[PDB]
Amino acid sequence: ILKIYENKGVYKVVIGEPFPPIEFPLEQKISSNKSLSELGLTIVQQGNKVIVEKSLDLKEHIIGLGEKAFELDRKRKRYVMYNVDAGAYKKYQDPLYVSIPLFISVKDGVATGYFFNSASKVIFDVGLEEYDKVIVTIPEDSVEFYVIEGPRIEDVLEKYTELTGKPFLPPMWAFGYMISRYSYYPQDKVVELVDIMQKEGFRVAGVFLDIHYMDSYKLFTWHPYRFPEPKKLIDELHKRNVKLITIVDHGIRVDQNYSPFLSGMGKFCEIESGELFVGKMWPGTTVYPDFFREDTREWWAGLISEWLSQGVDGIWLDMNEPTDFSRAIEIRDVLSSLPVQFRDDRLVTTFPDNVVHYLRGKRVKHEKVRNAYPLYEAMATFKGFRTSHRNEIFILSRAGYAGIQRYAFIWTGDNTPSWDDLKLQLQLVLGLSISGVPFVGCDIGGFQGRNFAEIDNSMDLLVKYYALALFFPFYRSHKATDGIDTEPVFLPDYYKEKVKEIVELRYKFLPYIYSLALEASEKGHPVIRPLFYEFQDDDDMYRIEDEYMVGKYLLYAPIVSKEESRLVTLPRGKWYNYWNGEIINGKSVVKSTHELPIYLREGSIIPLEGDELIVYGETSFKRYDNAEITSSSNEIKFSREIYVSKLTITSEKPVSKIIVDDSKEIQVEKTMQNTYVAKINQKIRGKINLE
């Protein structure tokens, strides 16, 4: 059986009788006229497997697949989609924590998307098995996938987001500077550190509490000695306008007197033979919630809601691949004596094969729906915020699947501090971003501490991390237990000042970043983007990976080496050097002039902290507070009255004066080449004219 449904440039191809890990609504199920051959696809059904083939041309680009430790153009590699605890991952390691079975093809400048809605171990052989083919193997007898027409990459993502879910809109503080560690404690130390940070000028949005805050790693408990007074801790942080985010794993301790274990009974994962799936995790012997069940989701939402009611501001979901250590520990117990070195097979940390779940009333094998586990956990956790009537929602997840963007931010896990990691992190967050997950980031400074030689803890590298993630949506510093203290307040003045200036610059651009976040939640456009996203028709762009676009207007080329300057590749069009005012013509390579290489595209409007505003060329932009700004000839229109402090206009033609609402004239000042400034400091009814 083969059915093809069409609507809005999205074709739903159904092979056999699929049982999706999650059902995505289609607001118009119209049988399509186009056939597989007109779609350029070949399909084969074999021993409980479905193979989908597509040709691959020499100049064709393949992007997506989410979190991959590889170049953005995915050709010449066989990818595996299977959520796994990657440990201290290195480049070219696969698979990782997140699985987004979506890839976009750009041929002759036209983009087309392919989304396979299966959470099983899907294989994407991109021109490896057959140099001229993309072969997708789904380890199931049935499957549903979608062909998403473009022609722009942005067009594919809008439709994809429409299909799987728009990103939730988080609070502005979720994009602030977060400090974290594994872990901060006891409670008095948490407050002491926050005080020193603030006293030295660092604006801290929130602090993350890792597993040391729990009582014997038991979820929803406070360590009796380190955190005897949770209320005191909470009020002190809130008193300092600092949010508190607490980590929450997925393992429930098999403890006779542990409430969650007793109340969750009946809603835990089982194994083929009917018993509970008992494994090993932080709290020791543990069982896991079967988040695929509606009731398990309701139970979890309740615990979360109750947990949030103490004043906790956010939830950090970890180890939710889902991960289990019983197999690893079993091996370590039997061969512990032997003086031999074990191989590091990460797949050993996934759930065993005999584990089963109940999806929509049906009993299914874990291997068929594994990757959607974190999605359902996030869903239940999001539901927990609703149950608490909490409008400001903040959820961080390590693992994910298509649709995860509806409920959480995703960070790249346990990275290793090193110069090469700077480039790796950029590929990771951009891969995730181009795959439908907009709110992403990495651990600034790297997670790994000092448990192995290949770790670089130099301070100038640390500064480069802060600078690298300058525009990442999620900006958090996190470090392992045995790692050196990486909080800015512990750095020599020389380095401390640099971090301080970088963080201040981030807050200065927060308004723009947040506006892009609103755009993401409304249209599904990613916040940070690889250059080929805005210039998909230029093949060169698919090889540029140490540069990224922030929204549609800002190009950032972070310095990812020890050099003092770097070569910057500029796409077609004109670009304005943010720091010295120079305007360069696109499709060229130039040398960076500042430590933070920022360029504005001709046709930009950028809202800055303190009601500042930068305008260059003609375009239209919607600020996060709903205020729309439009620039044309020599006029800047406002959808509604708004305050404007400092206005910066970049222009090749001189600007002698501006006129507010036809009457008042404000003094213009040339601050540098092509740069004109006007100190307005007043509300504007609806427009400004340039002369």
Ligand X SMILES: CCCCCCCCO[C@@H]1O[C@H](CO)[C@@H](O)[C@H](O)[C@H]1O
Residues that bind ligand X (CB under 6 A): 85, 87, 414
Which one of residues 45, 387, 388, 457 is an interface residue with a second copy (CB under 8 A)? 457
Estimate to the nearest angstrom the gap between the alpha carbon of 417 and the chain centroid: 19
Task: Quote the least distance from Cβ 151 to a second copy, whole Å.
Answer: 23
Minimal CA–CA distance to 276: which of 294, 254, 258, 296? 254
Residue 125 contact, options a second copy, ligand X, none, Cβ 5-8 Å cut-off depending on partner type? none
Query: Is 333 among the residues that bind a second copy (CB under 8 A)?
Result: yes
Residue 85 contact, options ligand X, a second copy, none, Cβ 5-8 Å cut-off depending on partner type? ligand X
What is the CB neighbour count within 10 angstroms for residue 679? 13
Q: Which is nearer to a second copy, 133 or 574 (CB)?
A: 133
Query: Is 40 among the residues that bind a second copy (CB under 8 A)?
Result: no
Is 607 exposed, middle or buried (CB count within 10 Å of its CB: 0-12, 13-18, 19+)? Answer: buried
Task: Quote the least distance from Cβ 194 to a second copy, whole Å.
Answer: 11
What is the total count of residues that contact a second copy (CB under 8 A)?
A: 68
Which one of residues 228, 284, 610, 654 is an interface residue with a second copy (CB under 8 A)? 284
Query: Is 93 among the residues that bind a second copy (CB under 8 A)?
Result: yes
Residue 78 contact, options a second copy, ligand X, none, Cβ 5-8 Å cut-off depending on partner type? a second copy
SS3 track for 559-589: CCCCCCCCEEEECCCEEEECCCCCEEECCEE
Residue 414 contact, options a second copy, ligand X, none, Cβ 5-8 Å cut-off depending on partner type? ligand X
Position 603, amino acid: G
Task: Quote the least distance from Cβ 691 to a second copy, whole Å.
Answer: 57
Q: Which is nearer to ligand X, 85 or 377 (CB)?
A: 85
Tell me the Ramachandran region of residue 222: left when phi exceeds 0, alpha when psi lies from -120 to 50, beta otherwise: beta
Selecting among 67, 73, 125, 318, the annotated active-site residue is: 318
Tell me the Ramachandran region of residue 391: left when phi exceeds 0, alpha when psi lies from -120 to 50, beta otherwise: alpha
Q: Which is nearer to a second copy, 91 or 664 (CB)?
A: 91
Query: Is 30 among the residues that bind a second copy (CB under 8 A)?
Result: no
Which one of residues 199, 231, 239, 343 is an interface residue with a second copy (CB under 8 A)? 343
Residue 561 contact, options a second copy, ligand X, none, Cβ 5-8 Å cut-off depending on partner type? none
Asked if residue 322 lies in contact with residue 351, where contact means CB atoms within 8 angstroms, the answer is yes
Asked if residue 119 lies in contact with residue 367, where contact means CB atoms within 8 angstroms, the answer is no
Mask of contacts with a second copy, 256-275, x by CB under 8 A? xx----x--xxxx-xx-xxx
Distance from C-alpha of 55 to C-alpha of 63, rounded to nearest angstrom: 15
* Structure tokens that stand for 558 in this block: 């972070």
Catalytic (active site) residue 414? yes
210-246 b/e with 16+ CB inside 10 Å = b? Answer: bbbbbbebbbbbbbeebbeebeebbebbeeeebbbbb
Query: Is 585 among the residues that bind a second copy (CB under 8 A)?
Result: no
Query: Is 90 among the residues that bind a second copy (CB under 8 A)?
Result: yes
Reduced to 3 states, what is the DSSP secondary structure of residue 484? coil
Task: Quote the least distance from Cβ 118 to a second copy, whole Å.
Answer: 21
Strands of 252-253's sheet in order across: 252-253, 284-287, 279-281
Query: Is 46 among the residues that bind a second copy (CB under 8 A)?
Result: no
Query: Is 341 among the residues that bind a second copy (CB under 8 A)?
Result: yes
Distance from C-alpha of 608 to C-alpha of 674, rounded to nearest angstrom: 19
Catalytic (active site) residue 485? no
Sign of the torsion angle spanned by Cα atoms 583, 460, 476, 85:
positive
Q: Which is nearer to ligand X, 313 or 414 (CB)?
A: 414
Selecting among 125, 158, 414, 421, the annotated active-site residue is: 414
Mask of contacts with a second copy, 130-159, x by CB under 8 A? -xx---------------------------
Query: Is 232 among the residues that bind a second copy (CB under 8 A)?
Result: no
Task: Quote the least distance from Cβ 102 to ligand X, whole Å.
Answer: 25
Reduced to 3 states, what is the DSSP secondary structure of residue 599? strand
Minimal CA–CA distance to 438: which of 545, 546, 544, 517? 517
Task: Quote the least distance from Cβ 524 to a second copy, whole Å.
Answer: 39
Residue 620 contact, options ligand X, a second copy, none, Cβ 5-8 Å cut-off depending on partner type? none
DSSP for residue 604: E
Task: Quote the least distance from Cβ 376 to a second copy, whole Å.
Answer: 18
349-370 b/e with 16+ CB inside 10 Å = b? Answer: bbbeeebbbbbeeeebebbbbb
Query: Is 567 among the residues that bind a second copy (CB under 8 A)?
Result: no
Which one of residues 339, 493, 591, 633 is an interface residue with a second copy (CB under 8 A)? 339
DSSP for residue 485: P
Task: Quote the least distance from Cβ 173 to ligand X, whole Å.
Answer: 25
Q: What's the alpha-carbon Rg for the chain, to the nearest Å?
A: 26
Question: How big is the CA angle at 329 (ends 326 and 330), to the nearest 5 degrees?
Answer: 80
Asked if residue 440 lies in contact with residue 412, where contact means CB atoms within 8 angstroms, the answer is yes
Which one of residues 345, 353, 522, 540 is an interface residue with a second copy (CB under 8 A)? 345
Tell me the Ramachandran region of residue 313: left when phi exceeds 0, alpha when psi lies from -120 to 50, beta otherwise: alpha
> How far lies 634's CA from each of 230, 641, 685, in Å?
57, 19, 17
Distance from C-alpha of 244 to C-alpha of 178, rounded to nearest angstrom: 10
* Structure tokens that stand for 278 in this block: 């008992």
Residue 87 contact, options a second copy, ligand X, none, Cβ 5-8 Å cut-off depending on partner type? ligand X
SS3 track for 351-395: CCCCEEEEECCEEEEHHHHHHHHHHHHHHHHHHHHHHCCCCCCCE
Query: Is 184 among the residues that bind a second copy (CB under 8 A)?
Result: yes
**Of 255-263, 411-419, 467-475, 500-508, which part binds a second copy (CB under 8 A)?**
255-263
Residue 343 contact, options a second copy, ligand X, none, Cβ 5-8 Å cut-off depending on partner type? a second copy
Q: Which of residues 424-453 bind a second copy (CB under 8 A)?
A: 449-453
Selecting among 67, 94, 321, 443, the annotated active-site residue is: 321
Task: Quote the least distance from Cβ 481 to ligand X, whole Å.
Answer: 7
Task: Quote the least distance from Cβ 495 to a second copy, whole Å.
Answer: 14
Catalytic (active site) residue 255? no
Query: Is 537 among the residues that bind a second copy (CB under 8 A)?
Result: no
Residues that bind a second copy (CB under 8 A): 58, 70-71, 73, 75-78, 90-93, 128, 131-132, 183-186, 189, 192-193, 196, 212, 216, 253-257, 262, 265-268, 270-271, 273-276, 278, 283-285, 330-331, 333-335, 339-343, 345, 449-453, 455, 457, 481-485
Catalytically annotated residues: 318, 321, 414
